[PDB]
Design a protein around this ligand. Structure first.
Ligand SMILES: [Mg+2]
Ligand SMILES: [Mg+2]
Ligand SMILES: [Mg+2]
Ligand SMILES: [Mg+2]
Ligand SMILES: [Mg+2]
Ligand SMILES: [Mg+2]
Ligand SMILES: [Mg+2]
Ligand SMILES: [Mg+2]
Ligand SMILES: [Mg+2]
Ligand SMILES: [Mg+2]
Ligand SMILES: [Mg+2]
Ligand SMILES: [Mg+2]
Ligand SMILES: [Mg+2]
Ligand SMILES: [Mg+2]
Ligand SMILES: [Mg+2]
Ligand SMILES: [Mg+2]
Ligand SMILES: [Mg+2]
Ligand SMILES: [Mg+2]
Ligand SMILES: [Mg+2]
Ligand SMILES: [Mg+2]
Ligand SMILES: [Mg+2]
Ligand SMILES: [Mg+2]
Ligand SMILES: [Mg+2]
Ligand SMILES: [Mg+2]
Ligand SMILES: [Mg+2]
Ligand SMILES: [Mg+2]
Ligand SMILES: [Mg+2]
Ligand SMILES: [Mg+2]
Ligand SMILES: [Mg+2]
Ligand SMILES: [Mg+2]
Ligand SMILES: [Mg+2]
Ligand SMILES: [Mg+2]
Ligand SMILES: [Mg+2]
Ligand SMILES: [Mg+2]
Ligand SMILES: [Mg+2]
Ligand SMILES: [Mg+2]
Ligand SMILES: [Mg+2]
Ligand SMILES: [Mg+2]
Ligand SMILES: [Mg+2]
Ligand SMILES: [Mg+2]
Ligand SMILES: [Mg+2]
Ligand SMILES: [Mg+2]
Ligand SMILES: [Mg+2]
Lengths: 124, 262, 180
RNA sequence: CUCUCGGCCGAAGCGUUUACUUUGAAAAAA
RNA sequence: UGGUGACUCUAGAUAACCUCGGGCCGAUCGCACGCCGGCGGCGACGACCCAUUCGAACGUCUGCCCUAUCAACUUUCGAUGGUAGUCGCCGUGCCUACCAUGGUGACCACGGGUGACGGGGAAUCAGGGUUCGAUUCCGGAGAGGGAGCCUGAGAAACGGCUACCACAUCCAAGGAAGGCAGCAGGCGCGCAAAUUACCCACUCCCGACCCGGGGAGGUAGUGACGAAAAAUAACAAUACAGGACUCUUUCGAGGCCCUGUAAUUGGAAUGAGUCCACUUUAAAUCCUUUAACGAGGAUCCAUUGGAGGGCAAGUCUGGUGCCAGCAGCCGCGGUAAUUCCAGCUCCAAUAGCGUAUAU
RNA sequence: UACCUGGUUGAUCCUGCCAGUAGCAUAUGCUUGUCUCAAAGAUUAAGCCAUGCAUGUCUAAGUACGCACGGCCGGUACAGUGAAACUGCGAAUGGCUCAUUAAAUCAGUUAUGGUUCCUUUGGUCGCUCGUACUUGGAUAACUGUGGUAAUUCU
């Protein structure tokens, strides 16, 4: 019941189709507030929906009073999918990374380097 | 080292970029262009470190690939494009225009200009040569060559270029009494009236310049840029009007602002 | 090449003569009177005072109208007045040479916590600070060697999340109340 | 320091040349 | 015509030339589509030349350690200069032909050595100095040792090629393939130095490129190199060695203040740990934030060196008896050892402190 | 913090060194609870290396007749996604190390009026009086026959 959100800095990135701000969270007696509900607070504060709000970099100060992070509110979900880094979309479930490792791909590449044209597709 | 170098160490980057130490090993390494590497401001530095429109380099690339940034009226999608002195950066999507003008402390200040003033620029002339069936040619500090210039235009003069067409509209001759900015050295960013120029044949020429507050300083001739005819500049000056405060008066001004705050 | 910084300093210096009665006695007096952990804290304070005295001595030999002397002397005097070591009525450069080690030791958070009555001893003050019971303004300060600024002195409270300030009983009180 | 040029000054020499001293400029970042 | 301090510069005029191993003078792609029978808007590639940027390469001036048990050196095979050329991207003995006899040196030439890559810098330092700089920035060099090349704007490139020298792999004995002073890792050498980990999320680089790649780089692991902060207890009550303070006449009184045997009591406060959840992050870990548990020998138990002098702290006790040993130096030990071996006590620094070596 | 102390003599004052004292770097010993930074096969062997990785790259816009997918319509030359291959660019940067090197390297200062320069940027690109409503031959990918114990061979 006692969790306050304030936004210190604020700018409208018209070129990146969003609003970017610094968020400070007041939670005097609780753990660091989860991102999922900071998103709800931001959506209610800015009269948007939580699906276009991306928050990150939340660091809690010594003594346990406040947390500070950054937030973006996109004009639309398609703009967010165009402009957001892929890992932040994966946090919201909108993106999935490939399951291969660096070693797997590197060894496959160096194996393919030993064969001529179509046989390159026959090694994996 | 065989062949040209393609990297730039962060600690080896020019100091006026105001780059920190712990963000990375490397620096943006400006692309080859109209301005020298040491005297330019790469597009990424301006768009990310200065204006805070982007948080990372990838965001700067995303901004530039939508063709929103124009440098002197032309769309520039290269994020390491060297933008230098008197360049005009236009962002139509958000609708602002900047002119890269040195601040008093020798750094490119964020200086917003009106869209009327973003239609032209001033260029120092570097050389004049006749070629190709007796056609004269001018070369500016911006690496643009203009054929058929006014016969009165001599070296070390200043020409006003209409960015849309690229032609000369008027000019200021290099003479005592004309306003100038220092574009290099210890007095970089300082604005004053030219007092006297002493010639040393076979060597560098020294130009003496007096501020609006009465302070005088010398520079080399290659470090002088004619800004206006007489006391009146032909462009808008940054918030600091080109005068340098000593550290004492700067501290006094800061303290006065602190006292008046709140 | 890496993206790391390697600037670091030693905050103290060691005395040249390891065993001498007068120095040992004076250091022990300071340790007992200000509740210090060891002699390294005394030598740390001594080193800061020595650096300040060296800077002042460098400035004194300069000309009075020298702009560098005026600038850094003003900065040094304002820093010393700001932490409470110097008096505003004694804001001349030579008075810096009159400062003692006890002046810098009196501005620690430990001694100020003891002087304000939040603790009944200097050692109780140290354990109170290290146990997160003490706050300066709104920030809970955990470091005994926290030089209290002159403006920051009036805001030293009991850290309202602590049992002494915020009225929440600790481990021992809760366990002993459960035994009832 | 003066005799000449250009608008009382700006120019020109050369006072044997310096060393020295003071100033100014140019001088990577760390 | 224009320019420079200074052109044999720039431009102009004339007579020719213009390499078959040729110089430019568009036979290229995409998107919108149009107008008046033909004209066209945006771009992308390409291109001789000029300028510009990024350079690079030669030069100018001054500056380098030790050594004379190195005093004369270079010049017949260029040493110094002149003339003409060759080659080179160009200025040049760069090389050639012909000439001249020059050029350097006690102001240290030439030769030798260096545990010599050079700087920015580092340690110490009153002032002056001495020493270090392989090491993340700049410059140079090299890719086992020499040498020679192709391609290319740019290598005399070695994660390109061709040989020889030294090593060395597979072989069916005919042949083939090599280069970790890249990241990990192994051997060897040693007094002496970490994981055959995760990732392109950040900084930037490359490419035809908003998209791919990057052991550059970032993140963890090991890590007492070193630097910063900083626990190992605090308080109250007793009881007192007790002390000061205090009246009284000595006791006493003095119950104000302090210290400590306190294996005397007593509740309070905590984080080291264990551990949900957040937060962190590319994914994590750590730190920070917060539940729950978590301290009386609070055994949740601080060490390393010393105790004759230098130099701080025991001529206390037991053992040994010029032995064993200590001792940087002076010295201690031969039956009452302030010095050895121990117990107790004490003191110096303290999460650190001894020792060897360079300075 | 501009500092000294023990040791030659029966005793003294000197010279003078030895020893002590503090810092800094390497190694090593004993010890080690929290937390933030952080050096790290330089020294001896620029000694030798198993194994894996460290340099690749496509836009709307050079070349697509791989059904490998997918058509929409099915003669609409060429829908689109697109492996491969040709073409172009990069691979001369970065990283490592310190063997060589003693006016050499390097540093500051100057010069190129004595040269080269991919790229980016601007100029120039009907300036020349002499089949075009589009020219020619290949080669790769692909399809098929193979050789060698063996290679990123062909
Ligand atoms: Mg390199
Ligand atoms: Mg010149
Ligand atoms: Mg510097
Ligand atoms: Mg010649
Ligand atoms: Mg000759
Ligand atoms: Mg000859
Ligand atoms: Mg060597
Ligand atoms: Mg050296
Ligand atoms: Mg080195
Ligand atoms: Mg070495
Ligand atoms: Mg280097
Ligand atoms: Mg090489
Ligand atoms: Mg080797
Ligand atoms: Mg080679
Ligand atoms: Mg290799
Ligand atoms: Mg290489
Ligand atoms: Mg290795
Ligand atoms: Mg061994
Ligand atoms: Mg070690
Ligand atoms: Mg990346
Ligand atoms: Mg990528
Ligand atoms: Mg690395
Ligand atoms: Mg671990
Ligand atoms: Mg050690
Ligand atoms: Mg430490
Ligand atoms: Mg903790
Ligand atoms: Mg002991
Ligand atoms: Mg003993
Ligand atoms: Mg002793
Ligand atoms: Mg003593
Ligand atoms: Mg010893
Ligand atoms: Mg002894
Ligand atoms: Mg004698
Ligand atoms: Mg004697
Ligand atoms: Mg000594
Ligand atoms: Mg010692
Ligand atoms: Mg922990
Ligand atoms: Mg190394
Ligand atoms: Mg080695
Ligand atoms: Mg290819
Ligand atoms: Mg290119
Ligand atoms: Mg290439
Ligand atoms: Mg061009």
């Amino acid at each position: 019941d006692t969790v306050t959100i304030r936004t210190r800095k604020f700018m409208t990135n018209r070129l990146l189709q969003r609003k970017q701000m610094v968020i400070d969270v007041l939670h005097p007696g609780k753990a660091t507030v989860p991102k999922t509900e900071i998103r709800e607070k931001l959506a209610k504060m800015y009269k948007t929906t939580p699906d276009v709000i991306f928050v990150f970099g939340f660091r809690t100060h010594f003594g346990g009073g406040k947390t500070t992070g950054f937030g973006m509110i996109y004009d639309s979900l398609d703009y967010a999918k165009k402009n957001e880094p892929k890992h932040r979309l994966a946090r919201h479930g909108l993106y999935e990374k490939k399951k291969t490792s660096r070693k797997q791909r590197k060894e496959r590449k160096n194996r393919m380097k030993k064969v001529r044209g179509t046989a390159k597709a026959n090694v994996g | 080292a065989r062949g040209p170098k393609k990297h730039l160490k962060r600690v080896a980057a020019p100091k006026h970029w105001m780059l920190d130490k712990l963000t990375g090993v490397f620096a943006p390494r400006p692309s080859t262009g109209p301005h020298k590497l040491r005297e330019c401001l790469p597009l990424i530095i301006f768009l990310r470190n200065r204006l805070k429109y982007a948080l990372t380099g990838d965001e700067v690339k995303k901004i530039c690939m939508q063709r929103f940034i124009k440098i002197d009226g032309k769309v520039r999608t290269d994020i390491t494009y060297p933008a230098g002195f008197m360049d005009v950066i236009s962002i139509d999507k958000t609708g602002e225009n900047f002119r890269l003008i040195y601040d008093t402390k020798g750094r490119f200040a964020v200086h917003r200009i009106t869209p009327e003033e973003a239609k032209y620029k001033l260029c120092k002339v570097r050389k004049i040569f006749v070629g190709t069936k007796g056609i004269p040619h001018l070369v500016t500090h911006d690496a643009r060559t203009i054929r058929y210039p006014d016969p009165l235009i001599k070296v070390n003069d200043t020409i006003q270029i209409d960015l849309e067409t690229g032609k000369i509209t008027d000019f200021i001759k290099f003479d005592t009494g004309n306003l100038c900015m220092v574009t290099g050295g210890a007095n970089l960013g300082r604005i004053g009236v030219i007092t006297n120029r002493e010639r040393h044949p076979g060597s560098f020429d020294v130009v003496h310049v007096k501020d609006a507050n009465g302070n005088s300083f010398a520079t080399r001739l290659s470090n002088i840029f004619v800004i206006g005819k007489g006391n009146k500049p032909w462009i808008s000056l940054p918030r600091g009007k080109g005068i340098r405060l000593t550290i004492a008066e700067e501290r006094d001004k800061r303290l006065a602002a602190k006292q008046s705050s709140g | 090449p890496v993206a790391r910084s390697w600037v670091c300093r030693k905050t103290y210096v060691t005395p040249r003569r390891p065993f001498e009665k007068s120095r040992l006695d004076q250091e022990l007096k300071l340790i007992g009177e200000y509740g210090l952990r060891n002699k390294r804290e005394v030598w740390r304070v001594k080193f800061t005072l020595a650096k300040i005295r060296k800077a002042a001595r460098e400035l004194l030999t300069l000309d009075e109208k020298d702009p560098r002397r005026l600038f850094e002397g003003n900065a040094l005097l304002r820093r010393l007045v700001r932490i409470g070591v110097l008096d505003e009525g004694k804001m001349k450069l030579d008075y810096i040479l009159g400062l003692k080690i006890e002046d810098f030791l009196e501005r620690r958070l430990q001694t100020q916590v003891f002087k304000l009555g939040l603790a009944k001893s200097i050692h109780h003050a140290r354990v109170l600070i290290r146990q997160r019971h003490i706050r300066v303004r709104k920030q809970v300060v955990n470091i005994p060697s926290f030089i209290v600024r002159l403006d920051s002195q009036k805001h030293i409270d009991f850290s309202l999340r602590s049992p002494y300030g915020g009225g929440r009983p600790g481990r021992v009180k809760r366990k002993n109340a459960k035994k009832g």
